[PDB]
Amino acid sequence: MLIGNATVIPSPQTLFHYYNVNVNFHSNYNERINDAVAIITAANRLNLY
Amino acid sequence: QYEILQKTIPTFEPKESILKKLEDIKPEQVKKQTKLFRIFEPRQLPVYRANGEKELRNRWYWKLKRDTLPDGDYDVREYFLNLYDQVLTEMPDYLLLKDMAVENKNSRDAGKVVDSETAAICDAIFQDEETEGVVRRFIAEMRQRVQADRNVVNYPSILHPIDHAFNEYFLQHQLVEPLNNDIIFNYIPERIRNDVNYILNMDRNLPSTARYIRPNLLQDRLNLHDNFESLWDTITTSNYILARSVVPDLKELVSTEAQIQKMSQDLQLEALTIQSETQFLTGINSQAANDCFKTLIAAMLSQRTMSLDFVTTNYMSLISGMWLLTVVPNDMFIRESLVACQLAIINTIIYPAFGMQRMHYRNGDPQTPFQIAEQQIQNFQVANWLHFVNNNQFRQVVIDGVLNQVLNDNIRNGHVVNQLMEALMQLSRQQFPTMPVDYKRSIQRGILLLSNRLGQLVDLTRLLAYNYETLMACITMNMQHVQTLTTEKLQLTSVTSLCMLIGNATVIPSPQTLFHYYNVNVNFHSNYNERINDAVAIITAANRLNLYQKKMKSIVEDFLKRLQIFDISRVPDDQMYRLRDRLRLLPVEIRRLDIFNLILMNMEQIERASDKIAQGVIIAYRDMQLERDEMYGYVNIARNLDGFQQINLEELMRTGDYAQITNMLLNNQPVALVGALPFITDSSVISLVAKLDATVFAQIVKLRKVDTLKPILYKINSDSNDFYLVANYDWVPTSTTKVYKQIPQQFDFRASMHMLTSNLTFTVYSDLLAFVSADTVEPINAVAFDNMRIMNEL
Amino acid sequence: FLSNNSMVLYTDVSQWDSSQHNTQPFRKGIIMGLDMLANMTNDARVIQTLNLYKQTQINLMDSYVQIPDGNVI
RNA sequence: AUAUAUAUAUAUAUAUA
RNA sequence: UAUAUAUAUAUAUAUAUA
Numbered sequence: 001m002l003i004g005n006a007t008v009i010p011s012p013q014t015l016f017h018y019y020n021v022n023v024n025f026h027s028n029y030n031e032r033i034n035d036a037v038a039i040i041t042a043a044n045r046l047n048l049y
Numbered sequence: 050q051y052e053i054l055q056k057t058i059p060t061f062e063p064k065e066s067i068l069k070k071l072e073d074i075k076p077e078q079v080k081k082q083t084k085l086f087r088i089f090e091p092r093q094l095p096v097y098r099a100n101g102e103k104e105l106r107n108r109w110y111w112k113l114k115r116d117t118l119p120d121g122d123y124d125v126r127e128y129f130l131n132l133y134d135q136v137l138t139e140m141p142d143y144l145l146l147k148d149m150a151v152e153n154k155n156s157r158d159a160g161k162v163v164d165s166e167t168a169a170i171c172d173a174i175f176q177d178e179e180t181e182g183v184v185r186r187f188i189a190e191m192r193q194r195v196q197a198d199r200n201v202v203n204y205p206s207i208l209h210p211i212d213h214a215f216n217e218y219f220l221q222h223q224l225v226e227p228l229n230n231d232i233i234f235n236y237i238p239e240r241i242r243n244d245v246n247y248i249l250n251m252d253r254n255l256p257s258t259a260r261y262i263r264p265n266l267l268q269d270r271l272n273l274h275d276n277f278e279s280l281w282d283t284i285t286t287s288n289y290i291l292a293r294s295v296v297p298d299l300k301e302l303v304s305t306e307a308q309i310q311k312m313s314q315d316l317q318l319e320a321l322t323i324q325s326e327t328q329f330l331t332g333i334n335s336q337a338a339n340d341c342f343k344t345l346i347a348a349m350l351s352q353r354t355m356s357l358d359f360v361t362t363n364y365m366s367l368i369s370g371m372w373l374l375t376v377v378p379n380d381m382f383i384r385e386s387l388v389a390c391q392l393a394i395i396n397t398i399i400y401p402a403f404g405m406q407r408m409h410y411r412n413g414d415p416q417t418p419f420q421i422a423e424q425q426i427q428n429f430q431v432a433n434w435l436h437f438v439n440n441n442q443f444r445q446v447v448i449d450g451v452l453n454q455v456l457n458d459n460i461r462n463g464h465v466v467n468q469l470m471e472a473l474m475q476l477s478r479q480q481f482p483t484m485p486v487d488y489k490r491s492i493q494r495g496i497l498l499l500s501n502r503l504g505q506l507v508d509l510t511r512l513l514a515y516n517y518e519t520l521m522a523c524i525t526m527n528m529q530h531v532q533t534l535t536t537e538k539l540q541l542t543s544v545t546s547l548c549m550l551i552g553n554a555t556v557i558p559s560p561q562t563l564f565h566y567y568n569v570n571v572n573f574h575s576n577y578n579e580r581i582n583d584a585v586a587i588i589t590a591a592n593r594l595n596l597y598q599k600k601m602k603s604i605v606e607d608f609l610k611r612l613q614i615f616d617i618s619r620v621p622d623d624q625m626y627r628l629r630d631r632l633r634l635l636p637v638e639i640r641r642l643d644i645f646n647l648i649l650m651n652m653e654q655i656e657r658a659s660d661k662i663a664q665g666v667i668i669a670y671r672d673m674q675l676e677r678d679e680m681y682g683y684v685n686i687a688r689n690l691d692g693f694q695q696i697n698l699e700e701l702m703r704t705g706d707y708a709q710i711t712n713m714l715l716n717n718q719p720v721a722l723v724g725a726l727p728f729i730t731d732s733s734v735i736s737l738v739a740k741l742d743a744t745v746f747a748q749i750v751k752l753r754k755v756d757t758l759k760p761i762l763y764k765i766n767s768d769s770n771d772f773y774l775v776a777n778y779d780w781v782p783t784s785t786t787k788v789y790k791q792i793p794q795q796f797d798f799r800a801s802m803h804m805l806t807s808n809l810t811f812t813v814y815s816d817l818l819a820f821v822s823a824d825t826v827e828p829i830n831a832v833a834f835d836n837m838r839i840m841n842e843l
Numbered sequence: 844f845l846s847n848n849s850m851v852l853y854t855d856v857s858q859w860d861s862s863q864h865n866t867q868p869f870r871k872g873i874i875m876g877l878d879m880l881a882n883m884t885n886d887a888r889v890i891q892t893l894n895l896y897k898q899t900q901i902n903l904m905d906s907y908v909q910i911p912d913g914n915v916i
Numbered sequence: 917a918u919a920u921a922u923a924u925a926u927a928u929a930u931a932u933a
Numbered sequence: 934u935a936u937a938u939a940u941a942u943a944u945a946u947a948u949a950u951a
């Protein structure tokens with residue numbers, strides 16, 4: 001009981017920034033699994049206790 | 050020797066508006082027009098022949114007066130709602146033509162034409178040497194025709210046929226009805242002129258000329274008592290304070306100031322000191338009898354719900370509450386406070402009298418404790434009064450077109466007191482077996498101060514139901530019985546001051562304060578239905594004109610404003626957009642419906658016959674001959690938008706997806722843009738051969754914006770420079786794009802004269818109850834609905 | 844009402860006179876309250892005493908204090 | 917030659933040609 | 934055999950408070 005008849009829309013400048021911060025975290029989360037796996041596995045083929 | 054140190058206080062303007070009572074609402078000041086409604090005006094234009102050369106004579110044409118048309122196809126419809134609000138305020142109530150009739154400067158006999166403008170036109174044609182002879186001969190035989198026996202006249206005019214259909218409608222549809230002596234007496238309601246006590250008199254008789262404007266007194270098409278519990282609270286607290294003003298003061302209280310001096314100089318002579326014959330009680334005054342007589346009548350006529358206020362430890366205020374519930378119907382007393390008074394009579398006075406156990410009445414039982422103690426009691430006379438209180442209801446009958454809630458027939462008689470005091474006597478002859486003897490002596494002393502007053506209480510019921518019956522003839526709006534939000538506190542220790550302090554003097558409401566209570570319930574009810582119909586005619590004309598962007602809170606915001614009793618800024622958007630769904634469903638009144646069709650039928654003839662706006666440009670990408678006209682010469686005009694695919698520029702700005710046009714503008718498809726474009730005039734011919742008209746559309750591809758469009762409308766004629774290219778070389782001018790524009794109409798003088806008619810004389814009268822001067826019969830013998838009188842008790 | 848699920852809250856404004864919320868929004872809240880009360884009654888005398896208690900709030904919305912020092916006021 | 921507002925409780929005192 | 938009803942006197946000074 002305080003809303004009016006005037007709608008709000010996510011403007012496309014803050015709709016591409018929300019996309020380019022969810023891609024840039026998802027492409028950072030996947031690029032650090034691939035770095036941490038490639039060192040764990042390379043510490044095992046090299047027989048590093 | 051002073052010194053001023055002043056600082057900046059921040060300005061704070063709270064949202065508010067002025068609120069007037071119903072006593073001072075000014076009636077609608079009647080509108081009569083002074084000049085005709087003109088929107089078209091003849092203008093002098095040069096004329097060009099079929100070659101293109103300028104002719105020696107000139108020609109007259111109809112153009113607009115102040116042609117300010119906004120661009121874009123949505124702003125044009127926003128202009129025509131604004132035009133529709135301009136004809137309504139100019140629409141007159143009564144129109145006489147003797148007020149607006151100026152002399153023709155030159156005629157056969159010196160007659161009159163109907164306006165200062167249409168005399169300025171007919172003298173502009175006379176001295177113009179280029180005019181024909183038979184146009185000049187028509188102005189000579191242009192006089193008025195006057196007929197005295199029917200008092201109508203016939204003044205000539207020179208009006209556009211759109212302008213004539215707006216002025217002809219103002220003359221035949223007027224709000225004046227004739228008025229005489231036998232129609233002033235029909236203005237007074239039927240329960241007053243058919244009443245014995247008031248004798249109606251008048252001095253002057255009105256002529257066969259005088260007219261009056263009848264108010265549209267039809268009931269509220271909005272059901273503002275249905276689901277509107279915050280607007281019906283303030284429309285009945287505005288009626289309760291009006292009704293409190295006209296309820297008269299009791300004759301035992303009021304007298305003039307000098308009569309106190311007139312009664313003090315003979316008080317020591319004539320010793321009359323216990324003539325009033327009452328036993329005094331602490332808490333009894335006469336200022337509460339006068340108060341409770343006004344908050345019993347004025348809370349019935351406005352249908353407020355009273356709330357009882359009392360203390361349980363007063364055994365006399367509970368006995369006087371027995372008279373209150375048996376006269377006023379229990380639907381008016383509020384349920385949380387009727388029950389706590391209806392139970393307090395049971396547990397104190399009725400049930401200890403019979404020795405029964407005092408009732409366990411839990412909170413919120415659906416049966417009120419008189420409706421549960423007519424079954425549990427075994428007497429016959431106190432179970433006959435408890436049946437009347439359980440079934441005392443208002444009787445909703447419609448009288449003279451106004452539904453108003455008359456009382457039960459026994460209450461107007463007085464016979465309910467003879468049902469109560471027959472029951473209040475059997476309850477006093479009981480033994481009170483459980484309670485001690487002093488508790489029996491405390492009621493039997495107090496229940497006998499009310500049974501000794503039977504002649505003065507069978508008559509208060511007559512007088513209280515006659516002041517309510519008389520004043521109810523003066524209402525006009527439909528009184529509905531719906532429980533309101535806020536209540537009016539009636540103290541039960543102030544009914545005791547009413548029940549045993551009245552006597553032998555009828556107070557009947559004088560007819561000068563019945564005609565005032567009726568002339569403020571008409572002046573508010575006619576200020577209601579002329580604000581419904583003013584705010585329905587814009588809501589329906591907004592949806593009919595296709596205004597999808599207009600938020601219609603604003604034209605309900607001023608509907609609640611012009612009703613002068615509402616505060617706007619404490620009424621939210623919730624109670625102003627529910628009201629739009631009710632005002633939309635109503636039929637718009639016939640004067641506004643018949644004049645919106647006179648705009649809607651030719652909102653394309655006003656729009657097309659004006660400069661500085663053109664209804665879309667068409668593009669062809671091929672040489673085609675531009676048509677020869679007489680007011681333009683040679684113009685790339687197109688009268689019909691036919692053969693081409695259309696793009697709606699109202700929609701191309703709305704959705705904003707330009708992918709259709711910018712893929713259709715690079716490939717050179719023939720496109721006819723549709724909208725309302727501001728066009729410029731390029732009168733030179735060497736701009737046409739250089740093809741300037743095609744180079745203006747390429748700013749839609751690089752830049753998305755389409756409102757910065759200016760199509761080119763050529764005009765090739767003799768006054769234009771470099772014209773000899775058309776004269777020497779045998780070529781007709783060819784353009785690429787032509788403008789969809791309409792030719793202005795010719796001013797044919799003999800076909801535009803109209804003979805406007807109206808009456809000769811009125812005398813429009815404002816209110817009609819100034820003439821009839823009423824007076825009341827002596828209140829010693831004043832007659833109720835029974836032909837026996839009231840205040841008959843010795 | 845002091846218990847272990849309750850919190851008491853005592854606040855003292857630094858100066859109740861000469862606060863920002865007391866110059867304009869306190870007078871104009873009372874002057875509005877005497878407009879809705881001028882419609883409640885009907886007398887020429889209860890309105891007139893309620894048009895004087897409104898007039899003392901219009902006159903105090905701007906005020907001046909007379910304090911002297913040395914020889915100047 | 918002489919400056920101390922308003923309200924709320926509480927206590928003391930007082931009324932007369 | 935029978936033992937009445939009803940909640941805010943005024944003025945100045947004084948202190949506590951706002």
Ligand SMILES: O=c1ccn([C@@H]2O[C@H](COP(=O)(O)OP(=O)(O)OP(=O)(O)O)[C@@H](O)[C@H]2O)c(=O)[nH]1
Pocket residue numbers: 855856857858859860951
């Ligand atoms: O003699 C007085 C004392 C107080 N008051 C009124 O009581 C109000 C509150 O009095 P306070 O003493 O609480 O004011 P304050 O908040 O300015 O105090 P500090 O924090 O500065 O210590 C004041 O602002 C004034 O309206 C008076 O009218 N007269």
